[PDB]
Amino acid sequence: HRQALGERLYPRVQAMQPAFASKITGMLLELSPAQLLLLLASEDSLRARVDEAMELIIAHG
């Protein structure tokens, strides 16, 4: 189930942050089942969370 979600998530993440698509998709795929379903159901929520992930990648760096 988590795998099937990630296969759908990846192209959508890639359209938002193509240079970090696999990294960010992998970060999202650690999240809870409920949060993953929310992200796949709502591109608006997904965009916010992908932006958050990108900001964390830069900050950690």
Task: Say how far apart CA 31 and CA 28 lie, in whole Å.
Answer: 6
- DSSP state at residue 20: G
Specify the experimental method: X-ray
Q: Evaluate whether 15 touches 40 at the Cβ level (below 8 Å).
A: no
Element (H, E) at 21: helix 21-28
Count how many domains the chain has.
1
- DSSP state at residue 29: T
Give the contacts of 13 (CB within 8 A, at least 6 positions apart): 21, 24, 25, 28, 46, 50
Task: Say how far apart CA 48 and CA 51 lie, in whole Å.
Answer: 5
CATH code for the domain of 23: 1.10.1900.10
Q: Evaluate whether 24 touches 13 at the Cβ level (below 8 Å).
A: yes
Host domain of residue 48? 1-61
What tokens appear for 4 in the block?
A: 């099937």
